[PDB]
């Protein structure tokens, strides 16, 4: 019953922008922290962003700090990831994950962001 | 409802030992860790260690390793902190603290009234 | 950032064999205040998203068979499958979640003769 | 060690003003940033937990937020009762605190 469904992935040109969406169900979304994790075509995993239950805390790796923005809507039970100035390195399958403490115990199927000419 | 009552003030000479008590009520004593935090006059909070009253295990900050002893007497829901070889900078108020919930015991929601220890 | 080195990159074994895979972090993942290793293991089956297998280095997630065992402390961690079954065919990622940014290992590709059911 | 640097060390404001208290971590570690309010003669009281969640009985004029290693405690519409010292915490580590005085 616990479930995460990402959406919003799409083909985009370098320098483009996207806002990913994640629908959470099966648990009290407003009580757990969430993160975004992407998997490159080479199958490498890279943590992208984290947000606490309230949205009052966020963190990213410094290399994605200026271009990525995580946010949530605890009424719609939705998690978001705004992406801008996309680069070729951003090509990956972007997973929506639930945090218990700071490990990821629930993963969605993911949505694909492909950046290329 | 949760209450942490500590022993009264202590006056000690340098080199002596002090033992502070912390009697808990209003919850299941063995269910929650008990932390100890001290504060010198006009200074900030300083963590000392915790004790798991269900198992008796302890953990001390490196500052106090070998000089602090934490014990518990479950039959009376009381926790103890004994600090030896007291020196002047050990003058402080010594608090016992319980966590907000067992999931994350570092959120000290419950505090004792504090016990003043004056050294030298 | 903390580097997570997994070994082997990949291996192929037969049903019932023992599998030992290691994960080494460039820095200790053990926090003295709670004596917990911030190390997790994730299993990704073919065509599926990663799933939490072990966290705190040794604690199995719900439903994970005792066949899997996580051990180690500090920097050197190990995951053992006492006797692999077909369903164990997957990639096994380790992750340190103490130091931001959270980092994953390269993964261990586990192939099993006869497929994965 | 996680060195929590709180600034300013002391601050004096008048009722109705806004206080912005900073707490910066020397290292970025997975933890739950807590804030404490210690009034004169009393033990600390849990004020904020998990960076931005208000503890029990804490009014809405107390707001906490965080971004990476930078944390902020904002006290809007200050009141005389808000006279206290405010500490931040991650695991065993505490900041030196901000002594907030109110006329």
Numbering used by the authors:
A (entry chain A): 1 to 52, 52A, 53 to 82, 82A, 82B, 82C, 83 to 113
B (entry chain H): 1 to 52, 52A, 53 to 82, 82A, 82B, 82C, 83 to 100, 100A, ...
C (entry chain Q): 1 to 27, 27A, 27B, 27C, 27D, 27E, 27F, 28 to 111
D (entry chain L): 1 to 91, 96 to 107
Original authors' sentences:
VRC01-class antibodies are among the broadest and most potent bNAbs isolated to date. These antibodies share the same Ig heavy chain (IgH) V gene, VH1-2*02, which encodes a CDRH2 (complementary determining region 2, heavy chain) region that makes critical contacts with the CD4 binding site (CD4bs) on Env. In addition, these antibodies express Ig light chains (IgLs) with 5-aa-long CDRL3s (complementary determining region 3, light chain), a rare feature of human IgLs that is nonetheless required to accommodate the CDRH2-restricted mode of binding. To expand bNAb-producing B cells and their precursors and thereby give these cells a competitive advantage, we explored an alternative, non–Env-derived immunogen approach using a monoclonal anti-idiotypic antibody, iv8, that binds VRC01-class precursor B cell receptors (BCRs) with high affinity.
We produced an anti-idiotypic monoclonal antibody against germline VRC01, iv8, using hybridoma technology. In addition to germline VRC01, iv8 binds other germline VRC01-class monoclonal antibodies, including NIH45-46, 3BNC60, 12A21, and VRC-CH31. Similarly, iv8 bound to a chimeric antibody comprising the germline 8ANC131 IgH (anti-CD4bs specific but derived from VH1-46) paired with germline VRC01 IgL, but not to germline NIH45-46 IgH paired with germline 8ANC131 IgL that contains a 9-aa CDRL3, indicating that binding mostly depends on VRC01-class germline light chains. To determine the molecular basis for iv8 specificity, we solved the crystal structure of iv8 single-chain variable fragment (scFv) in complex with germline VRC01 scFv at 2.4 Å. Indeed, iv8 primarily interacts with the IgL of germline VRC01 (constituting 80% of the total buried surface area [BSA]) including CDRL3 residues (Tyr91, Glu96, and Phe97). Of the remaining germline VRC01 BSA; 60% of the contacts are with CDRH3 (Asp99, Tyr100, and Trp100B) and 40% with the germline-encoded VH1-2*02, including residues Trp47, Trp50, and Asn58 that make critical contacts with Env. Together, the crystal structure and binding data establish the dominant role of the germline VRC01 light chain for recognition by the iv8 paratope. More than 80% of the iv8+ B cells expressed the VK3-11 light chain found in VRC01. This is consistent with the extensive interactions found between iv8 and the glVRC01 light chain in the crystal structure. As might be expected from the structural information, the IgHs were not enriched for VH1-2.
